[PDB]
Amino acid sequence: KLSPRQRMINMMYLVLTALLALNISKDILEALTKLNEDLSSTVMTVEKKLAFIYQAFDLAASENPEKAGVWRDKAYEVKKQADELHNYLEGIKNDLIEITGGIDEKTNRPKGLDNREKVANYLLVNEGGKAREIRARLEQFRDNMKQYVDEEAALINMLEALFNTEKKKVGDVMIEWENATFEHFPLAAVIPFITGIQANVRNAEADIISHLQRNI
Amino acid sequence: AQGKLSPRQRMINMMYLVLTALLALNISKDILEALTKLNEDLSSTVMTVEKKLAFIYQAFDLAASENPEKAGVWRDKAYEVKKQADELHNYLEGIKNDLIEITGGIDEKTNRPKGLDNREKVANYLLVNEGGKAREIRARLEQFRDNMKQYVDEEAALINMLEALFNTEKKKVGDVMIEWENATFEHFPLAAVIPFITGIQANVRNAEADIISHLQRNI
Amino acid sequence: VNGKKFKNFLAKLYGFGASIVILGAMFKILHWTGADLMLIIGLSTEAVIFFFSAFEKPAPEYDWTLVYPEL
Amino acid sequence: VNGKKFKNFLAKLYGFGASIVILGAMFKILHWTGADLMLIIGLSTEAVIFFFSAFEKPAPEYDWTLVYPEL
Amino acid sequence: VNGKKFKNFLAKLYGFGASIVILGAMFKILHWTGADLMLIIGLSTEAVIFFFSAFEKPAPEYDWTLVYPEL
Amino acid sequence: DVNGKKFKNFLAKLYGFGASIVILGAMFKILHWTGADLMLIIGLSTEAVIFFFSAFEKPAPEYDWTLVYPEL
Amino acid sequence: VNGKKFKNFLAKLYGFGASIVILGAMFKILHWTGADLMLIIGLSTEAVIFFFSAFEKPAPEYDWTLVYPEL
C-alpha cells in the first residue's frame, strides 16, 4: 500500500515535469536574436530616411553654395564619421559571429548563441579586449559630434547620454564601461548591444543633421 | 511511518523535490537587463523613425498646397495610412502600459517596471482573461496588414514585407505548430514581452515608413 | 464513512483522474484544444481525492518485537 | 485480464514509460530536436499505467492481531 | 511529542498539503488569477510537510534471519 | 544481462551517484551557473538508464499468507 | 558505518534539507535576501545525502517460501 503523500508524489512528478517543459519551451536567446533583427530593420529604416537629407543638402548647395555649401561640408563630415563607426561595429559583430561558429546553414543565425567564453575573451581579455577600442572610438565620435554642434543645446545632453562611457557603480562597486556592458553575457546578448550602439550612432547622426539642416 | 521506500521510489521522490525547486526557475537577471536595454534601443530608434516621418507628412502637406490636383489624393492616402499606423501604435502602447501596471507598476527607484520577471500575470492578461488580449493584437495586426495592401500598387517587395512583418501564422515552437498568440507571448516574462510589443511597434513604423516612401514617389 | 466500499471506490477515482491529468498535461505541452478541460476536471478530482485521504485510518504498523524477542 | 501475464507486461511498460519521460525532459531542457515526441510517448504510457491501475485488486491488507493476540 | 496525536496530525497535514499542491499546480498550468499566490502557498506547504516528515519515525526494518535461519 | 547480486550491487551505486548529479545539476540550473546543462545530461541520462533496467526486475513474490495462516 | 542511528540521522537530515530547498526556492521567487544561499545549502545537503546512500547495502529480500512451503 502507498501512503496518500506517496500517491500524490507519483502523480505529481509527471505534472511538475510538464510544468518544467512549459517553463523552458521558449529559448530566450532566440528572442534576443529576433529582437536584434527588429532593431537592425529599424536602424536600416532610419539610415534610409537620413540618406534623403544628404540628397537635400546636395541639391540645396548645388545652386547657391554661398550659404549652403559651408553646411554640406559640416554635414558630410558627420556622415563619414558615423558611417565609419557603423562599419567598425558591424565588423566587430562579424568577428564575434565568426570566432564562434559562423552563420547557421539553415536558420541563418549565429551557430553559438551561448558561447560566452570566446565572446568574453575577445571583448575583455585578448590584447586587452576589443571593448576598450570600442569605448575609445565612441568617445572620439562623441567629441567630434560635440564640436560639430555649435549651439550647446539639449543635443549635448543627448550626446553625453547615448555615449555615456563614464563609470557606473553597482552595489557601490566601481566597474569600467567595458565591464558593465559585455561581461558574463552570451553572444546572443552582446550582438544586440553592439546593434544598439549602432542605433545610437544613427540616432545621433540623424538628430545632429536635423539641427544642422535648420541652420541653412 | 510507511513501508520502506524502494530504491526507485526514493528516486521518484528526489525528482519530485528537484522539480518543485525548479518551479523557481526563471531567466537570469542579466538577460532581464539585456532585454530592457534592447527595449530602450528599440523605443529610441522608433522615436527617431517617427520624427523622420513627421517631415515626410509635412512634405505631403506642402506638395498638396500648391497643386491640389496631382498631390491631393496622395496626401489623403498618406494621411489615411498615417491614421491607421498611429492608431495601431497607440493601441500597442496601451497594451504595454496595461501589462506594466498589472504586474506591479514602475519601480520609482530604478524607473524600470517592477514585476519584470512575472511571467504569470502577463500570461493571464495576455491569452487568459476574456480569451486574452493577444487575440485582439492578432486581429489588429491582420486588419492593418490587409488594409495596407490597398495602398501598395501590387509592388512585390512591399507586399512581401507586409506579409512577412505581419506574418500571423503558426510558429514552430519545438516540433509543434503553436498558434501565433501563444508562440509569441506565452512562457515569457514581462522583461521579454514588452520588447516583443515594441518590436511589433517597430514593424508598424517601418511598414508605414516605406509605404509613405512608396506613396511619395507617385507625386 | 471511510470503510471498505468507499476506499475501494476512492482508489479507482484516483487512477482515472490521474490518467486524465497526465493526458491533460501532455495536451498542454502540445497546445491542443482539450488541454484546459482535462486539467480542470483531472486536477480538481485529485484535489478532492487527497482531501478525503486526510481522513484515512493509518496502517496498523505492527511491532513484531513483542512476538519475537531478539528481533 | 489483470492476472500475471498482463501485470508482468504492465510492469515492463512502467519502466520504459518513466525512462522516456526523463529522456524527453532532458531533451526539452537541452532544446534538442525530438523533445516533444518523447514527452508524448512517455506521458501517454504513464497515463495508460494509471488507467489500468484503477482496475487492480486492492491490497489484501492482512491482519495479524487476531492470530497473534495483543500485538 | 511523537505519540498518537502527532501521527493523526501528520496524516491530516499530508492529505491537506497534497490537495493544496494540486490546486497550486492547476492555477500555475492554466495561468489563473491567483497563480503566483497559489504557488507561494504550495511551496510553503511543501516546506512545512518536509520539515515535519523529518521527525517521523522510520520503518523498524526487522532482521528475520535472526529468527528463521535463512528466511 | 543477469540481475542477481553482482548487478544490483553496481546498480545501487548508480542510484546514488546519478541522483547526486541531478541534485547539483538543478542547483546549477536554478542559479544559472555554466555547468548546469552538462550535469543535467549526465544525471538525467543516468536516471533514464536506471528506469530502463527496472523494467526487467523480477516483481515482488506477493505471498498469500492465508494458506499458512487461516483467517489472517 | 551504515547501521541504524546513521540511517535515522540521515533521514532527518534529508527532511530538513528538503525543507530548506523549498524555502530557498520560495525566497528565490519572492526576491528575498538569502535565496541563493538557502538553495545551495539545501541542495548540497541533498546531493551529499544521496551520495552516502550509494554505498548502502541492498534490501535483504527475504524468501518466505524457504520456511513456509507452498506459500
TrEMBL record, chain F:
It comes from the Bacteria. Residues 14-72 form the Gliding motility protein GldL-like N-terminal domain. The chain crosses the membrane at residues 14-32, 38-56. The keyword Aminoacyl-tRNA synthetase does not apply. Keywords: Membrane, Transmembrane, Transmembrane helix. This is Protein involved in gliding motility GldL. The chain holds residues 5 to 76 of 223 of the full protein.
